[PDB]
């Protein structure tokens with residue numbers, strides 16, 4: 001759906017921004033600094049699940065640009081493992097939210113955050 | 127979820143970018159320039175439905191900025207009508223896609239596009 005590489009870059013940066021916000025806005029809830037409303041968190045994690053599927057198709061071949069490292073494209077399988085692993089960490093968060101289980105939510109939130117870094121450390125330029 | 131107005135602006139611009147892409151990528155399909163695959167379009171319109179709910183909460187009071195016109199906030203009810211009307215135009219598109227009805231899809235796509243403009247004409251700076 002992208003006329004030029006720049007369009008893919010713009011898309012993925014926007015998708016990732018919207019993930020930062022839907023993930024990060026739960027930090028006060030996980031920390032207990034804001035109340036835990038199970039229904040609200042369930043709905044927010046559903047949004048996050050949808051968003052978290054979106055960036056990867058905007059790293060198609062030849063879409064070098066932005067802050068993406070070239071290693072995304074020199075080993076396709078390894079980048080795919082990282083995004084798939086990340087989306088499965090989101091599945092754990094979804095299951096916790098759907099269960100209304102705050103302990104579960106906290107653990108999964110931590111693991112999701114670690115997975116965001118795991119990717120950044122390999123694939124995002126400074 | 128926004129520390130500063132600038133964060134709300136960044137969010138809504140990213141959400142609207144992702145809507146432009148999920149809407150606009152169907153133009154070749156509606157025109158018949160690309161094949162119509164009902165299952166694919168159903169799934170894409172589901173993404174668009176999720177995205178199309180997201181910008182409006184990032185126009186909270188005091189979030190002037192970007193290319194938003196101030197009239198968003200001097201008549202809250204009228205801006206709310208426009209976003210709600212738009213989301214109901216998306217409902218028509220969703221119903222068409224879920225039915226697999228290409229004629230329906232074309233008509234709804236046109237009406238959605240008109241609704242994007244209807245808002246821009248009142249509420250988006252040049």
Ligand code: HEC
Pocket residue numbers: 009012013014016017019020023065066067068069079082083086112113115116117119120123124125
């Ligand atoms: C690899 C499988 C990634 C995972 C998992 C996550 N992110 Fe990431 N992110 C990645 C890349 C390669 C890039 C650079 C994209 C580019 O072309 O510039 C990024 C970028 C971001 C950004 C900045 C977006 C922007 O406005 O330019 C943010 C805010 C960001 N990423 C956040 C983020 C979070 C919170 C994640 C887990 C919930 C996450 N990313 C996962 C690669 C990958």
Ligand code: HEC
Pocket residue numbers: 135138139140142143145146149191192193194195205208209212238239241242243245246249250251
């Ligand atoms: C009002 C109810 C709107 C509807 C419906 C749509 N858009 Fe719009 N859009 C609106 C505003 C007020 C703004 C400016 C936001 C700001 O603070 O700058 C916009 C902006 C856009 C953009 C640019 C985003 C960016 O990268 O800065 C795009 C690409 C865009 N809008 C697209 C778009 C489409 C395709 C719509 C219908 C499917 C649509 N918008 C509806 C207000 C409103």
